[PDB]
Amino acid sequence: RPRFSFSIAAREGKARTGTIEMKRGVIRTPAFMPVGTAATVKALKPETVRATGADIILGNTYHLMLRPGAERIAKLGGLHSFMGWDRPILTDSGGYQVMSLSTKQSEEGVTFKHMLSPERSIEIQHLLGSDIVMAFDECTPYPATPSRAASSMERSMRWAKRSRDAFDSRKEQAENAALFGIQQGSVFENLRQQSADALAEIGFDGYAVGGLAVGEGQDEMFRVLDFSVPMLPDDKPHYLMGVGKPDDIVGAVERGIDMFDCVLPTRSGRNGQAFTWDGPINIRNARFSEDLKPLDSECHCAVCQKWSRAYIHHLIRAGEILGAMLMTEHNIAFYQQLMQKIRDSISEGRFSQFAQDFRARYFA
Amino acid sequence: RPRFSFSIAAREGKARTGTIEMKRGVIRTPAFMPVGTAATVKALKPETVRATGADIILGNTYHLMLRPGAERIAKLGGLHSFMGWDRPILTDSGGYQVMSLSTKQSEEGVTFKHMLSPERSIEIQHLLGSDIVMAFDECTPYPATPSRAASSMERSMRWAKRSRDAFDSRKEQAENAALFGIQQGSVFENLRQQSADALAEIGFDGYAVGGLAVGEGQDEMFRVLDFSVPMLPDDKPHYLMGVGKPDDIVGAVERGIDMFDCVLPTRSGRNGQAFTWDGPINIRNARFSEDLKPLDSECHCAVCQKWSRAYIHHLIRAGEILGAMLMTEHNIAFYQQLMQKIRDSISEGRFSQFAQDFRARYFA
Ligand SMILES: O=c1nc[nH]c2cc3[nH]c(NCCN4CCCCC4)nc3cc12
Ligand SMILES: O=c1nc[nH]c2cc3[nH]c(NCCN4CCCCC4)nc3cc12
Ligand SMILES: [Cl-]
Ligand SMILES: [Cl-]
Ligand SMILES: [Zn+2]
Ligand SMILES: [Zn+2]
DSSP: OOSEEEEEEEEETTEEEEEEEETTEEEEESEEEOEEETTEETTOOHHHHHHTTOSOEEEOOHHHHHTTOHHHHHHTTOHHHHHTOOSOEEEOOSHHHHHHHOOEEOSSOEEOOOEEOHHHHHHHHHHHTOSEEEOOOOOOOSSOOHHHHHHHHHHHHHHHHHHHHHHHHOHHHHHHOEEEEEEOOTTOHHHHHHHHHHHHHHOOSEEEEOSOSSSSOHHHHHHHHHHHGGGSOTTSOEEETTOOSHHHHHHHHHTTOOEEEOSHHHHHHHTTEEOOTTOOEETTSGGGTTOOSOSSSSOOSHHHHHOOHHHHHHHHHTTOHHHHHHHHHHHHHHHHHHHHHHHHHHHTTOHHHHHHHHHHHHTO | OOSEEEEEEEEETTEEEEEEEETTEEEEESEEEOEEETTEETTOOHHHHHHTTOSOEEEOOHHHHHTTOHHHHHHTTOHHHHHTOOSOEEEOOSHHHHHHHOOEEOSSOEEOOOEEOHHHHHHHHHHHTOSEEEOOOOOOOSSOOHHHHHHHHHHHHHHHHHHHHHHHHOHHHHHHOEEEEEEOOTTOHHHHHHHHHHHHHHOOSEEEEOSOSSSSOHHHHHHHHHHHGGGSOTTSOEEETTOOSHHHHHHHHHTTOOEEEOSHHHHHHHTTEEOOTTOOEETTSGGGTTOOSOSSSSOOSHHHHHOOHHHHHHHHHTTOHHHHHHHHHHHHHHHHHHHHHHHHHHHTTOHHHHHHHHHHHHTO
């Protein structure tokens, strides 16, 4: 099997559909990655994650590098063996959550209550046995002045080069894994261009659009994607970090994005929000107490084949673990079915119509 | 399929092994019943409960009669349909937990902050669609004076007759379900005898030993079982309510018990205690942080086929739902494997040796 091979099978406008072949499996694009926090996709066995259609998961690095620790996970055989997921894992750099969850910044890296640098991040992801490694970057806060956005983006580009060099120095990592760079530049077109130029000069297997989904709102996010994604190499995957709601995903695919990760389906699941083709519902609402219909009328997932809204309503109101399990499996399956419909409609040259039909019904 | 047919295939001393055939399935005895609280075996899908080997589950009635309510569950198609378990369900009467979790007692029944009577209990269990219905009784507190134990037991016997009559008056229930009576009498042999006599005079499909596992300790529980179980009809199942730890179960089978229920494997599971053939372990203990062995070296369950102690240690310490899921599935599977070994050893006339071997290793 190849280390990393991206093939585009079909296009419609800026939207693409295709495959990434890697040693541990094939990734169908556009792809949604369920998020594994602390080496688990919350409330799901890996076999259930796979049953929903997921080809790849995102492994958060931040918690794992603290406990059990990256060296310990490597001693235990790597993250794949540890958690029982044998397909590709994309690991984040650890830095985003350092800024969010724990700090002193410098050119070397970030110190926090430990020092995380581009080199240490790459080594940690190596020890975990990551298939897709993210360059260590800085997510510029929103809003930012042009000067602050510029200095931040430039530091990220220097860190991108350091990430590239550290990755390339580790033969086994370079042979078996892939490395993605992350574009910054806030909402500023000229800075996004400078960032894309820098990343392309270094060269990566894929390119993420960073610095978005940080409070700017969908209109602004879409505006920035409009000019930012075409700046990236067309022949490599485009990854939008931390996105998003179903409508965010459809619009981002319309703008050339191939990969997504988001905690929404899992987090929402546990909190009682189920995604349906007619929009989200809160299953705790009294209107579902005697509703024998499945969560969604069309959904192919095992939860909708077997249990009613009324039962899941009861479980979530009772605080039962099975409620979290069933809601999460359905929500992840819904996201995967959304990605499948996106892939099929692009392949068939009817994605524009699908996007329109999806929105009309989802927001009715 | 028959409504209720108990067949004893083999005996060794007071121990029996056999089958109960019912309309929704066969129950292999001695049997362990996982407990479903609020219409779920906590942290397990019904398919997983079945995969562990369970033939029947216990449905607590107390919470369900409050929310969603018995009438509501009946409107939704009954408990089996509601929770997705299509095999036999034994329901308790609701009264034990009324005394434990919420009271004014009278000859009519128990009032609590609702009135629960033998007639109302039987009707609630009917509405849930129970396969094995428990007579409504009073669990005498321990310790009790002989006079208090006597008056309590006598009230329970009057309630047993009322339970019998209410059950028999409902044609569909009498045709499709079974009814068990519950022996009381505290630790007093003469009262246990009077209770057994009363229950046999009324006639039930099975007989529970009530009033035990309420603080008396194993030595005393075994002493009471020694004389109490032979008082019950030999040709019907014997059910020990709320028992217990693995060694409690082995000793109770040695004394003629055929059926068990206990929250221990599920509750312990969530709290980090795993049962093994070498005794219980607390998976949170630091000694398991790098232990790549399964929870138990011989266990056939899916958890022990795939995940390490180290991973489950990590999950439970992180408060992850998957930790509760995996611990619970293993513990229920362990209990079922214990029951299978008990059944096989009685069938083969080597149960005495099994009990000795089990204890020597479990308590080493
Ligand atoms: O620029 C980034 N570099 C590295 N990692 C990132 C992660 C991100 N995550 C988000 N947004 C997360 C949005 N999410 C929505 C659901 C609720 C929790 C927050 N933007 C990001 C940008 C970056
Ligand atoms: O005499 C009884 N009548 C009706 N229901 C019962 C339920 C019982 N449950 C117990 N003991 C429960 C022990 N269990 C052990 C694990 C932790 C929670 C308590 N004795 C019981 C007697 C009775
Ligand atoms: Cl997110
Ligand atoms: Cl119990
Ligand atoms: Zn579904
Ligand atoms: Zn096991």
